[PDB]
């Protein structure tokens, strides 16, 4: 019970915690309905609009005005944003030259720059292409400030995984939005955008920024805003709120519109009808940046733009229904649309086979605008899989297509037509999902352009602009230091765990009972007495410093004229394989009487190496090679890649896409790029949480063998920027692209692989690209730990994707 009869007069929009027999006047009371009586005719005070007028000008100081435009109100705090234009002749921000911010201008009581965060749904990077013309306020905070060309959502590229991605650092499947609909199976419940169920703090994991400022005694204005609540009342509030007393003022404030989302899903991002809320964005924008000019906080505050997520042309002439590929769409229950997530209706049901189902939707039509998945083998990039909450059957949608559960599902209208033409949530790295960022203030750096990164680095940002330490997440802190200024964050190298071993001889080929042949023999390289030594090796082949390992393990060091290797004792196969090709190296066959060639290694005990026969009993499993003999620089130093200590286990199937990329694509990128140098190595994750599986997670070994399968094989690919300096020679910024490639027993993700591979295994990697980063939380190694550029510089590479867009 609260006590509704209370009044909200000199109260409204206030900050404190008002509890339970007192009624509320703040952000989020009518949600509750726990408002005191006069709120709405008093808070949502609507009268005259928002903005002063020449008439307006001395003004009789009126009460129920929107705002206000009297002689004292920069006194009573309450002007509307422009009166100081309006009336005592004062420029628009926005028509005041930009001048560089090189240390905060605050009043006294300011102890810290404030940061306000103005966040926009559905801001589509391109929609800055409309620049000055149409946003001028955005375009001058845009070019005078900091800005990436875009911002790369999480996926799904809905509202609600974004936000709060964006307040917490974290995955979806770590906070647990993991879409704007969800089932919990232990709650039994269904959490909605809308309604009641959302406001539950069950569902709403890790640390959001409000919570890791409060925690840390740093005050925050509210995030949440009613519906109810007007946007230009939100603006106001905001500056209400920093005319606060020193000892209640916020820190830390953010706006939230829900435009240009709506007219997004209405016309189309390319509809005609997108200019007069891309407009209005702005105008809002300016009433702000006037606020804060008004009350000289505007060379004083740090001011992110930022947006959700991007949206794409989608109608309903592009709906894909599950009822032309199932025989019984009524038991199964499929959240719909730009991604599917299907579980039984009923749950737990005895009858539901996900296997039947995911056979009957996989590759049925030429041009099907769909692709069915197990969660598990979503491409890693994608972190979309350690949560109860996801469902196990996931269906990747085709940009500008729905997916619906039947034709019923469809309302097309008198027209022949639905009421929308556009939407979003597809896959991250599809260019029209892409958002935007903007830093402007003192904090930021100036008239500085940033390449582009993801949204979950952008909480350690608000964190170090804020004095903050955040809470883990999955950001990579330092990797944005170079948005800033000052308040950079002094990042340091994690500390190797394991050091390796260095093996000489320490056997005779007559030790080894592996089961393995060789029909031929290189006898010149018995009398290399330099054989398998450091030599130039390292220079060559480790271009950025031996990978550090940081878990406890027992490993090897591998030295050939080709290849570097680090050697697990504990798996019986590389972590990792270095080497570096040229752009004028050959490429050349496996010679006849070395097809089936395995040969021993006389470094590494026979107890902790592969064996043959295990490969020969196993009536699934083959072996491929991470040093490719195709790439031998010489016939005599092809014998080094036939080591079982090169030796992987591999599907018949992944074989297909490996070889391709070994004997073809490695070439073509060493031609293209002026030389690649390229890691690869296996990566074990049978929990599917993105983390380096301990030895009990393991969960296939190669028949009667203690040789573990890994579930997927990681390749880094590193050139020069400047590619006109050779990979081996590079004295400036780097260049990667890195992929982890599902190691299935099968291709049936790809729906042309009965043709050659040169028509569908690129196609293939291109899905399955990857950050450097995602590859050290899968294997638990740190890379280029030994390069010229700084550290902030390769956190930002290690961060890095290629997308293919
Ligand atoms: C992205 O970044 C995050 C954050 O660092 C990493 O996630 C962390 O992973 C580690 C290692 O597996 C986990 O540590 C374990 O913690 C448990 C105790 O866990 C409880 O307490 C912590 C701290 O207060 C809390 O964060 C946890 O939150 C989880 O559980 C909640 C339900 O209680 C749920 O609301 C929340 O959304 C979250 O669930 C997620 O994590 C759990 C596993 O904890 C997972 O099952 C689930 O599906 C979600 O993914 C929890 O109450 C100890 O007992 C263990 O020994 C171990 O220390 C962290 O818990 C986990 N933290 C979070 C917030 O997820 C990711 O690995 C990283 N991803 C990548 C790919 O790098
Ligand atoms: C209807 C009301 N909507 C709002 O408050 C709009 C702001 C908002 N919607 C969110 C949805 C999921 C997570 N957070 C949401 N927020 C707060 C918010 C979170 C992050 C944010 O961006 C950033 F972090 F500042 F960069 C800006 C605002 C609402 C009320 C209760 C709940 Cl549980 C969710 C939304
Ligand atoms: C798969 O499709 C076939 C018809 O092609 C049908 O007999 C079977 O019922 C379908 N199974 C499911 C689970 O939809
Ligand atoms: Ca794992
Ligand atoms: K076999
Ligand atoms: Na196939
Ligand atoms: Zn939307």
């Known amino acids: 019970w609260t006590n509704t009869s209370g009044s909200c007069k000199g109260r409204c929009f206030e900050l404190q915690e008002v509890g339970p027999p007192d009624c509320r006047c703040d952000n989020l009371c009518k949600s509750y309905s726990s408002c005191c009586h006069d709120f709405d005719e008093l808070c949502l005070k609507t009268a005259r609009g928002w903005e002063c007028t020449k008439d307006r000008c001395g003004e009789v100081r009126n009460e129920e005005n929107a705002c206000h435009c009297s002689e004292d109100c920069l006194s009573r705090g309450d002007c509307c944003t422009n009166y100081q234009v309006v009336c005592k002749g004062e420029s628009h921000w926005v028509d005041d030259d930009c001048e560089e911010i090189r240390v905060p201008e605050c009043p006294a009581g300011f102890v810290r720059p404030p940061l306000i965060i103005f966040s926009v749904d559905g801001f589509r990077a391109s929609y800055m292409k409309k620049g000055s013309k149409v946003m001028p306020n955005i375009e001058k905070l845009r070019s005078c400030g900091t800005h990436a060309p875009y911002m790369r959502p999480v996926y799904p590229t809905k509202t609600f995984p974004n936000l709060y991605t964006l307040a917490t650092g974290l995955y979806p499947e770590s906070h ?83 435009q240009p989302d709506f007219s997004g899903h209405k016309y189309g ?39 959700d997520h991007g949206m794409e042309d989608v109608t ?24 599917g997530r299907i579980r039984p209706k009923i749950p737990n049901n005895l009858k539901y086979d996900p296997k039947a189902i995911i056979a009957n939707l996989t590759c049925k039509k030429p041009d099907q605008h769909f692709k069915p998945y197990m969660k598990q ?30 034709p019923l599902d469809v309302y097309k209208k008198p027209s022949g037509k639905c009421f929308f033409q556009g939407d979003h949530g597809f896959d991250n790295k599809v260019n029209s999902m ?35 330490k955040p809470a883990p997440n999955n950001g990579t802190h330092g990797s944005l230091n170079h948005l800033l200024r000052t308040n950079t964050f002094r990042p340091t190298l994690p500390e190797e765990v394991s050091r390796p071993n260095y093996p000489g001889i320490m056997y005779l080929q007559s030790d080894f009972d592996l089961g393995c042949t060789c029909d031929d023999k ?5 009398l290399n007495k330099r054989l398998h030594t450091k030599g130039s090796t390292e220079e060559r082949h480790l271009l950025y410093g031996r990978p550090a390992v940081l878990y406890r393990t027992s490993y090897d060091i591998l030295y050939h004229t080709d290849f570097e290797s680090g050697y697990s004792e504990i798996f019986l196969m590389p972590l990792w394989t270095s080497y570096t090709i040229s752009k004028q190296a050959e490429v050349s066959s496996i010679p006849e009487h070395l097809t089936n060639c395995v040969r021993p290694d006389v470094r590494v005990s026979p107890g902790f190496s592969q064996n043959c026969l295990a490969y020969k009993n196993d009536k699934q499993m083959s072996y491929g090679f991470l040093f490719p003999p195709y790439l031998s620089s010489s016939p005599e130093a092809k014998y080094d890649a036939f080591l079982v200590t090169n030796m992987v286990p591999m599907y018949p199937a992944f074989k297909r896409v490996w070889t391709y990329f070994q004997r073809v694509l490695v070439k073509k990128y060493a031609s293209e790029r002026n030389g690649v140098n390229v890691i690869s190595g296996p990566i074990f994750d049978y929990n599917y949480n993105g983390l380096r599986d301990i030895e009990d997670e393991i969960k296939q070994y190669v028949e009667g063998s203690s040789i573990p399968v890994p579930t997927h094989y990681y390749s880094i690919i590193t050139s020069c920027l400047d590619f006109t300096q050779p990979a ?19 291709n049936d993700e790809s729906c042309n692989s009965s043709e050659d591979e040169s028509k569908w295994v690129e196609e293939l990697m291109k899905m399955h690209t990857a950050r450097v980063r995602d590859i050290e939380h899968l294997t638990g190694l740190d890379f280029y730990r030994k390069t010229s550029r700084s550290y902030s510089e390769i956190l930002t590479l290690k961060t890095y994707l290629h997308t293919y867009e």
């Open 522 to 526: 290189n006898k010149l390289e018995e």
């Open 728 to 746: 081996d020679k590079c004295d400036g910024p780097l260049s990667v692209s890195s992929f982890i490639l599902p190691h299935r027993p099968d």
């Open 434 to 468: 892409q958002t935007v960022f903007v830093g402007y203030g003192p904090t930021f750096k100036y008239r500085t352009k940033v390449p582009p990164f993801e949204n979950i680095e952008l909480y350690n940002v608000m964190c170090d602009l804020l004095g903050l």
């Open 176 to 258: 647990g939005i993991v879409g704007n609909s969800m089932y919990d199976p232990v709650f039994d419940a269904t959490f909605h955008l809308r309604g009641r169920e959302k406001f539950n703090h069950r569902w709403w994991g890790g640390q959001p920024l409000w919570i890791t400022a409060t925690k840390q005694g740093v005050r925050a204005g509210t995030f949440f805003w009613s519906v109810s609540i007007p946007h230009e009342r939100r603006i106001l509030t905001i500056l209400q709120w920093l005319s606060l007393p020193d000892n209640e003022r916020p820190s830390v404030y953010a706006f939230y519109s829900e």
């Open 316 to 339: 309903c002439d592009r709906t894909e229904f599950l009822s032309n590929y199932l025989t019984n769409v009524d038991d199964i229950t499929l959240v719909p649309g730009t991604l």
């Open 269 to 307: 991002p390319f509809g005609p009808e997108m200019t007069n809320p891309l407009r209005e964005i702005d105008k809002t924008v300016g009433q702000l940046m006037d606020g804060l000019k008004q009350l000289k906080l505007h060379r004083c505050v740090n001011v992110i733009f930022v947006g």
């Open 377 to 406: 083998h979503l491409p890693k990039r994608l972190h979309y899989a350690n949560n109860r909450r996801i469902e196990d059957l996931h269906l990747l949608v085709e940009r500008r297509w729905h997916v619906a559960r039947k």
